[PDB]
Amino acid sequence: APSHLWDIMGDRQRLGEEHPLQVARCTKIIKKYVINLKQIAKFVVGLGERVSPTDIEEGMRVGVDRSKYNIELPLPPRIDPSVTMMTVEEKPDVTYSDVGGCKDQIEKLREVVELPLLSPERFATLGIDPPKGILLYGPPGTGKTLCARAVANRTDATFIRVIGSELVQKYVGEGARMVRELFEMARTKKACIIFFDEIDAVGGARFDDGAGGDNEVQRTMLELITQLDGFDPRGNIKVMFATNRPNTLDPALLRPGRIDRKVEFSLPDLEGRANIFRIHSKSMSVERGIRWELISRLCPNSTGAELRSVCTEAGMFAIRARRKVATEKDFLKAVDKVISGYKKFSSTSRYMQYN
Amino acid sequence: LPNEAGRLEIFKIHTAKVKKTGEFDFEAAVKMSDGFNGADIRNCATEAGFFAIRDDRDHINPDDLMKAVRKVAEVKKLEGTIEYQKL
Amino acid sequence: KPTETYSDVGGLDKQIEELVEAIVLPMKRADKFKDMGIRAPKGALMYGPPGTGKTLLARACAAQTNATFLKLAAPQLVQMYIGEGAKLVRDAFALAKEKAPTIIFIDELDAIGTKRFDSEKSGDREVQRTMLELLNQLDGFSSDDRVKVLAATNRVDVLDPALLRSGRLDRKIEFPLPSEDSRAQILQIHSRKMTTDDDINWQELARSTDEFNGAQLKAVTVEAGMIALRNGQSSVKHEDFVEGISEVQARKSKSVSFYA
Amino acid sequence: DRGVSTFSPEGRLFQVEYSLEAIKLGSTAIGIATKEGVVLGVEKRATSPLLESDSIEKIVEIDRHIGCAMSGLTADARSMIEHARTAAVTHNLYYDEDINVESLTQSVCDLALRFGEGASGEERLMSRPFGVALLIAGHDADDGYQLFHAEPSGTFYRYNAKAIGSGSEGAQAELLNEWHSSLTLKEAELLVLKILKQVMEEKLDENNAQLSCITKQDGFKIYDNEKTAELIKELKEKEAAE
Predict the structure, then answer these.
(1) Per its UniProt entry, which superkingdom is the organism in (chain C)?
(2) Contact (Cβ atoms closer than 8 angstroms) between residue A43 and residue A37
(3) Burial group, residue C27, by CB count within 10 angstroms (0-12, 13-18, 19+)
(4) How far C22 CA lies from chain A's nearest CA (Å)?
(5) Do chains A and B touch (3 or more CB pairs under 8 A)?
């Protein structure tokens, strides 16, 4: 629709030659600027008309004119990162209250992450150092990522999603570049959150012999550790490591200096599993007078994934058994279905812990 | 690895331009390090300079020269034993 | 130069004096080595548990020299473009020409090296390329004892046996776990920025800490402040340090049989 | 291998550590040790009405005054039962007196704490670690009524109230509260049936539930199907008022 609202300006910013600049990176600063083109060509230029002497810095993309090379406008550094530009999300789904029950996992994470971001002056009175990293592993199916997304909602800032399979690329040595792409945006965008997903595919100690082609995996963590704690302790944002195989990780990865607060998820007890059915009681259909504490007692200790499956499957009996809403009789049938019927695999139940 | 007579000629090489004392050891340096290194002697020449600084002496103590050779035994710990590269 | 000095560390003087004889004394005493003809050590090997102060100790020595510092990571030497990583080591010592008294630091020396001949996969060779540059450059115009490099690695188990020579790395500096008096001075420095009642005796806490590295000691003062923060305490007492150190980890919470 | 000859670098073992899984997957066995005698009960877990519950037994009588509760694999446990009966009678051969229940349990564990085949200085009767666990009860003239737990891995312990099997973790929390030193014989029998019915999904009757008691006067008495059903009716009268 706005066809004529633009071309009116097409006789100034377009017909004239200003914008068509050749993107290139500056190397040495003599205060003579040595700049290397993307075509692999080097030259020397000076300042521009509107160019300030303090704007040009070492290792930064600087657009230069194609005909007569001169500095006109500076460009943001690191134009090469591409995939990491899609890792930024906004307005997640799971809220802070979506986690079933109030336990130690919620209170310990909000103090080391949400507290220093919302109240930076609280810990400044005692003059202490808030923990940079955290630890969440636990058994699978417990809603580990559900608790991690509850923190991103209260933060209201940039959330960086990092998949463990993203570190390994299709080129040897590219994995080291993917690590620096994550920490470069930490300085550009302050007070953000980065989250690792399934670091077991990368993080670990494989020693030497037995493969011969697997040395590409261990070189990613050695760069990740350097980018985390290097010769210069550079860091701002909090770091979250999450994987389902804690025993196969790097034995140095669990040491202090990166992760401080260690919180391991546990199987909810009768009091813990009771709130799981209560937070789901507001949804679906619950008959008046049904006590969910008796349903959770018949169910033994298991992961939270099977707990939410009870309320979901309970609504499925009303269609086959010819029922209006979910009754207590259909709840007992879900015990023999969600639990007793699925006792063949489809569960962890102290399966993967060490081996 | 040189033999017992081959190493003896090398100690005079590193101690030639380096200022020494006329008591500088001859054949005992070979007997001090056996099987630990037996290859790179120049490590011993660097370590011998630190013992003379603590005693405030420009010349190297012949006893400190033997102590520098003994120190090299624990310096490497790199394994690297070669019986397989003959062929 | 960095902002770290020797005053911020304590109890490591046994390992510090080994660093003073590498990049510190041979630089100022070079006039003595030229008259004596003794070649300064080309470098120093650093290993141990990863939670030590090897990053802090090497940082405290760089500021006292007041010279140009160069940081080069070993995993950064491998790139998808062939020859780009080979030019990194080649251009790293090229800056040691224009500026002769410089300092080069290599983190995670075990990151670059291997054998990989006999067994399957025929190796990689996208790594050892930049490793041959470390052997060739240090045997080239370098090794004037102004090129001294600080080599920091984790363990000694997996490494190229050809990395150690009188022209590359001489003094092998072991970093064991700090002792009683060594941990007492480290824990006291990290608590200087906190607020306490001055009733804490670190001699008892030094014995409460059993075989902890430099990183495990820093986490003590971090958790000690978190205990008084959640309880609403105005100061950190001695009981907060004992409670902060105690945690499961280890083998505790055993589902295993036997015991008895 | 990862067997008894391969010791784990973390300070543990493989084959025997996994043997606790067979215990956790076994039948629910509940018992309470009081001053009026120990009341033991198990769940026979009838899988079909054609199963004859009188022929199968998860509660075996070792001695007149000493009995056990078998929850687990019956095969691996029966070898210990034959050794338990032999050791209990062998002690009466050299002594002819009432033996301590802890001493009898130790004698059963003497064979049960050794496994393997190749040994330099001793013979090996067993072979592989067993994944079955029993609850041994009895009475003597010294410490009175005692209740134990048979662990083939480590040394046995004396438990006043112990639950094993599929309902081990479920019934363990209930034994830390309702248990008391003043519980009588009638209160102990009604408490076991109340806890066993909650951890059991099926209905409570004489077919899937069999209980026994160890006293001084009557020794070890097995509750028949007639008396067990009467104890269930007494539980229904207590639950009706509550």
Answers:
(1) Eukaryota
(2) yes
(3) middle
(4) 18
(5) no
Identify the bridge partners of residue B84 per DSSP, sorted by sequence position.
Answer: none
- The pair of structure tokens assigned to A345 is 């695999």
Tokens representing residue A215 in the block: 């040395």
**DSSP 3-state helix, strand, coil percentages of chain D (rounded to 5)?**
35, 20, 50
b/e code C133-147 from CB counts within 10 Å (16+ = b) = bbbebbeeebbebbb
Are the beta carbons of A171 and C80 closer than 8 angstroms? yes
- What residues does each domain of chain D span? 1-242
With a CB cutoff of 8 Å and minimum separation 6, the contacts of C154 are: A252, C47, C48, C49, C50, C108, C110
Q: How far apart are the first and last CA of chain B?
A: 16
Question: Counting beta carbons within 10 angstroms of the beta carbon of residue A36, is it exposed (0 to 12), middle (13 to 18) or buried (19 or more)?
Answer: middle
Are D125 and D111 a contacting pair, CB within 8 Å?
Answer: yes
Interface list for D 158-187 with A (CB within 8 A): 166, 169-170, 173
Please list the alpha-helical segments (H only) found in C42-83. Answer: 54-65
Q: Between the CA of residue A274 and those of A39, A103, A333, B66, D170, what are the distances in Å?
A: 65, 12, 18, 76, 15
CA D179 to chain centre: 18
Please give the Cα distance from D77 to D81 (Å, whole number): 6
Cα–Cα distance, A262 to D125 (Å, whole number): 47
For the domain spanning D1-242, the CATH number is 3.60.20.10
Q: After which residues is chain A broken (C to N over 2.5 A)?
A: 31
Interface chains of chain A (3 or more CB pairs under 8 Å): C, D
Alpha-carbon distance of A328 to A340, in angstroms, equals 17
Q: How many CA atoms lie within 13 A of A233 on its CB side?
A: 14
Q: Is A139 annotated as belonging to a binding site?
A: yes
CB contacts under 8 A, C 205-234 vs A, are: 213, 215-216, 218-219, 221-223, 225-226, 228-230
HSE at residue D220, side-chain half, CA atoms within 13 A, is 18
Q: Which residues of D touch A301 (CB under 8 A)?
A: 169
Q: Are A3 and A57 in contact (CB under 8 A)?
A: no
Joined together, the tokens standing for residue D37 give 């005698």
CA atoms of D64 and D53, how far apart (whole Å): 23
The residue type at A44: V
At D117, which helix (H) or strand (E)?
none
Rounded CA gap, D189 and A273, in Å?
A: 30
- Please state whether at least 3 CB pairs lie below 8 Å between chains C and B: yes
Instruction: Tell me the DSSP string of C79-140.
Output: -SSTTHHHHHHHHHTTHHHHSSSEEEEEE-GGGS-----SSGGG---SSHHHHHHHHHHHTT
A133-136 vs A238-242, strand pairing mode: parallel
Question: In the structure encoding, which two tokens stand for residue B69, read together?
Answer: 């050779």
CA distance A342 to C45: 56
Contacts of B80 in chain C (CB under 8 A): 161-162
Helix (H) and strand (E) counts in chain D? 6, 10
Q: Taking CB atoms and an 8 Å cut-off, how many pairs form between chains A and C?
A: 130
